[PDB]
């Protein structure tokens with residue numbers, strides 16, 4: 001005999017569907033899931049009904065629901081999200097220094113840092129999936145948020161990941177609509193040029209870890225065979241993230257918002273988060289340690305911001 005179940009892609013909109021006892025969900029819906037669990041080819045358990053299944057957007061209304069919720073047109077997204085969620089729901093999200101963190105697992109240290117950094121920045125997401133999952137993550141329930149970050153950045157559970165690259169995909173879905181940056185490049189020979197940067201690039205900079213240094217000038221190669229100076233004339237955003245490859249860099253109190261460091265090599269290494277509180281907290285998944293100063297291989301540093309305009 002048949003039965004009635006519900007299908008969804010966003011978990012908010014449900015669609016009543018007659019489930020023929022004969023087939024496997026896959027024959028009837030396509031790829032299908034339960035709580036992350038893949039069940040594409042299986043038979044409907046006699047007490048299966050009244051349960052909500054995920055499915056691939058196999059028609060207009062579904063495709064439309066996914067885009068609205070996820071803000072993606074990638075036909076594989078929903079299936080990758082589910083694979084990840086399937087595993088992230090096995091992770092532990094303890095409070096460490098008054099933030100949600102991640103107990104080490106499956107090379108997820110980088111996601112930990114992303115997650116700890118986000119919680120300290122006033123940033124909002126456009127995609128309802130991100131908004132909601134983030135709201136739930138700040139509240140200690142971060143399985144969905146991780147699975148989504150993984151899916152947005154095209155990574156799978158187990159792989160080691162780069163915090164910066166990951167920020168790049170995420171900040172693509174953050175409200176940076178008002179975020180503006182103006183940079184001036186002066187070459188003593190070539191002359192001057194000025195650039196306005198919007199979106200992700202208004203907030204993210206690869207070249208120095210120091211925010212002061214971008215204000216005072218950083219040297220860069222000039223097509224002229226010389227060394228140019230790049231400095232910030234104007235900043236409009238609630239934060240900035242500064243990145244460099246791992247080098248020995250000193251973190252003092254009162255100078256930054258938060259940071260992470262990477263120890264190891266490109267192929268194989270470990271991230272830890274540092275946050276500046278009453279004193280410095282170094283958050284390493286579940287583990288916590290304090291110090292008044294840290295000098296190590298910092299890779300990404302965050303600073304708070306409102307509006308900045310240069311003298312000069």
Ligand SMILES: C[C@H](c1cccc2ccccc12)N1CCC(C(=O)NCc2ccc3c(c2)OCO3)CC1
Nearest residue numbers: 160161162163244245246262264265266267268299
């Ligand atoms: C911050 C740091 C870094 C950022 C920028 C410059 C750096 C330079 C040196 C060391 C770290 C640096 N780091 C680089 C890549 C790393 C990563 O995701 N690696 C994945 C991976 C997995 C298996 C591999 C492999 C790479 O290559 C071989 O097999 C994470 C972040």
Ligand SMILES: [Zn+2]
Nearest residue numbers: 187190222224
């Ligand atoms: Zn030049």
